[PDB]
Specification:
This protein has 752 residues and is mainly α. The protein has one domain (1-752). The protein is built from 47 helices and no strands. Helix 36 (565-572) packs parallel to helix 38 and helix 43 packs parallel to helix 45. The chain is elongated, with a radius of gyration of 37 Å. The termini are far apart.
């Protein structure tokens, strides 16, 4: 073929290169029958390639007939000693085939330097290995990386001893599989007894030895270990540090750099963490080298330690030092830079921001959006995915906030890709685009989308609706929850649970566990006096699993303290139920002391955020008592959703309202509904205005108590217009002072 002067002169430099070029020219037709152009040039890129190419002509045709690819031929011939290796294959492929070695295995082994001797060694030792329980695949791994005959004999020599010392064949092959793995095996044999007495397990030894530089790592543990232990490092830490590639160097760096790092303020736990990742040695060194400059840029010590404590920690620090100026120019604050760099692969994320940031801005994303998308593990791939998929994202009709939402989580890149791949399919199934964004919009969203597509038909056929499915998979862990529904549906319904019960239990985060927990704990619940309906109520919220267990762990003490089964259910059966149930047991004696009945306690704790409501009563009951509020007033105020906030509102705004003419009874009335806090604040801020316009305090109390803040704002907004139209205060109050008062006001004001 037409070789450029570059392709030519590359070959000429090789020993016997001029002959190789000549051979190719003089034998171009013959070679073209067996190999492509690229195959020829690859083989030609080695010394004495003329011998190898001649061997291709002499062996190639037969090897083609015998099942060897062009790729295998190149692997064998394209190496030092390739001519000999290719001949060896042709002479031995048949016998090797008999022994259960595939074409691929034969080519792999022969692909080693001096592969001809590798193959002969295998034939000589195959029966020995087979007798000892090893497979053909093990032999290939042992022979790999130019292990050759020596690696095979090394394994045979040490195996029976390592066997007696409690090492598996899998451990042995794993260690042997690396470069210098045979030497690693001998090192294991020599050092294992001392390692064991120092306190290291077989597993730690195998793990340390099964990396490149493993033998050196084993030596480092024994020789550096004692000094590290004197420096306060445990054997578990030493093993973990040594357990990664470059483990030996990392241990030495802890020893060498440790003292100077501590004197700068870094703890030993921090030093160990930085060292315990791959590239820990470089990270430790980079900290010592770059910490002064980073501090001179303003980064705190804890910040530096955190960036270094992740995988790629060394790159993170270096990239942060390099990119920080340009990032700051783009008005990134230091905290944002830190957020982006403080994860695994932070360096790549920073570089992604620099590279893609400008384009992202032009697409409408702001700094916060970029920081959110890049500020996760895999942040670099998320930003990249956004730019690459943007035209398709635009076509499908996804908004920019939709993009930020499903890309702004861990796994965001995969979420975007999954939504473009599975989206149209799900829309044809009947799922809306906003529901698709919801499902894709959590970590694991890619799997959640797939789960829906896979299970939708079956679940619908069983009586579940598509909105039910959206509800179940629209949370974190959504795929698992849906899978749990499919798996456990039969059992739950056989036990007497309805499909809406199942949906409710599964329809919250942690739903997979909640479903299983209901199955596991139902019998125990019925025995302790609870009903199936109670179980659904308790498990049917966020943290339902913890709520159920909290019931089982606390029901005895609570019952003995005068709380009924119904009381327990009402307390535990809301969001944060486990905390509310615990708070009751913690404060019931003190609350009783302050004049609150069992029923009072249940009422206060029996709403969402019941624990905080209890806490708020204890913290404020004394002051409220002093001001003239009765125990019953306090219970009414705190005994609704948001009771803690309502209680605080009375505490903070009450006197002012009282100064203005509002009596305590009215204050209690305005506050003793859900959203009572908003009501009081609405009266505080807008009350004087309504009063100026001609509304009495009584009117204001009526509206605030029965219509809430919503109704007040509606009267504030539309009141003047209605008055000009001839409506009296009696009419406006009647219209507004009701649930939905805002809507009734709007209806009356409409024609104006």
């Amino acid at each position: 073929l037409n070789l450029s002067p570059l392709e030519r002169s590359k070959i000429e430099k090789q020993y016997g290169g001029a002959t190789t070029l000549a051979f190719i020219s003089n034998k171009q037709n013959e070679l073209a029958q067996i190999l492509s152009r690229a195959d020829i040039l690859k083989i030609a890129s080695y010394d004495c390639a003329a011998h190898a190419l001649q061997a291709v002509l002499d062996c190639g045709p037969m090897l083609g007939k015998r099942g060897f690819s062009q790729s295998d031929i190149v692997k064998i011939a394209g190496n030092i000693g390739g001519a000999q290796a290719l001949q060896a294959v042709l002479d031995l492929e048949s016998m090797l085939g008999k022994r259960g070695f595939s074409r691929d295995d034969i080519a792999k082994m022969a692909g080693n330097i001096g592969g001809a001797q590798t193959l002969q060694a295998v034939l000589d030792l195959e029966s020995a290995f087979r007798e000892r329980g090893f497979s053909q695949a093990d032999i290939v791994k042992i022979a790999g990386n130019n292990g050759g005959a020596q690696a095979l004999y090394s394994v045979l020599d040490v195996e029976p001893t390592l066997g007696k010392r409690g090492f598996s064949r899998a451990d042995i092959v794993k260690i042997a599989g690396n470069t210098g793995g045979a030497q690693a095996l001998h090192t294991v044999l020599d050092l294992e007894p001392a390692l064991g007495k120092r306190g290291f397990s077989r597993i730690d030894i195998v793990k340390i030895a099964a990396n490149n530089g493993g033998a050196q790592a084993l030596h480092a543990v024994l020789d550096l270990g004692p000094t590290l232990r004197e420096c306060g490092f445990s054997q578990a830490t030493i093993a973990k540090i040594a357990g990664n590639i470059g483990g030996a160097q990392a241990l030495q760096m802890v020893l060498d750099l440790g003292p100077a790092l501590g004197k700068r303020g870094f703890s030993q736990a921090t030093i160990a963490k930085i060292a315990g990742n791959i590239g820990g040695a470089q990270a430790l060194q980079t900290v010592l080298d770059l910490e002064p400059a980073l501090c001179e840029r303003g980064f705190s010590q804890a910040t530096i330690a955190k960036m270094a404590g992740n995988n790629g920690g060394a790159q993170a620090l270096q990239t942060v030092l390099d990119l920080e100026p340009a990032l700051r120019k783009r008005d990134f604050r230091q905290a944002d830079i830190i957020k982006i760099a403080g994860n695994d692969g932070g360096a790549q994320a920073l570089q992604a921001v620099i590279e893609h940031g400008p384009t992202l801005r032009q697409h409408g994303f702001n700094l916060a959006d970029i920081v959110k998308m890049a500020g996760n593990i895999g942040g670099a791939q998320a930003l990249q995915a956004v730019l690459d998929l943007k035209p398709v994202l635009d076509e499908h009709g996804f908004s920019q906030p939709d993009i930020v939402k499903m890309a702004g989580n861990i796994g965001g890149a995969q979420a975007l890709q999954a939504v473009l791949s599975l989206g149209p399919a799900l829309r044809e199934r009947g799922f809306s685009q906003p529901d698709i964004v919801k499902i894709a919009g959590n970590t694991g969203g890619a799997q959640a989308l797939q789960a829906v597509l896979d299970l939708e038909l079956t679940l619908v056929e069983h009586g579940f609706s598509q909105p039910d499915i959206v509800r179940i998979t629209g949370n974190r862990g959504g795929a698992q929850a849906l899978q749990a529904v499919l798996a456990l549906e039969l059992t739950l319904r056989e036990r007497g649970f309805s499909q809406p019960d199942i949906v409710k239990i599964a329809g919250n985060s942690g739903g997979a566990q909640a479903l299983q927990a209901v199955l596991d704990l139902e019998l125990t619940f019925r025995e302790r006096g609870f009903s199936q309906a109670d179980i659904v109520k308790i498990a049917g919220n966020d943290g339902g699993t913890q709520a159920l267990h909290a019931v089982l762990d606390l029901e005895r003490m609570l019952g003995e303290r005068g709380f009924s089964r119904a009381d327990i259910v009402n307390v535990a059966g809301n969001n944060g139920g486990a905390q509310a149930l615990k708070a009751v047991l913690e404060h019931e004696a003190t609350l009783n002391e302050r004049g609150f009945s069992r029923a009072d306690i249940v009422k206060i704790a029996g709403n969402g955020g019941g624990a905080q409501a209890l806490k708020a009563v204890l913290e404020h009951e004394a002051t409220l008592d002093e001001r003239g509020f009765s125990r019953a007033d306090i219970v009414r105020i705190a005994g609704n959703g948001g009771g803690a906030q309502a209680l605080k509102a009375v505490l903070e705004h009450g006197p002012t309202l009282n100064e203005r003419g509002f009596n305590l009874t009215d204050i209690v009335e305005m506050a003793a509904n859900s959203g009572g806090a908003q009501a009081l604040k609405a009266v505080l801020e807008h009350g004087p205005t309504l009063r100026q316009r001609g509304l009495s305090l009584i009117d204001i109390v009526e509206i605030a108590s029965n219509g809430g803040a919503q109704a007040l704002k509606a009267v504030l907004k539309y009141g003047p217009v209605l008055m000009q139209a001839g409506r009296s205060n009696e009419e406006i109050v009647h219209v507004a002072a009701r649930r939905g008062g805002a809507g009734r006001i709007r209806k009356m004001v409409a024609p104006l």
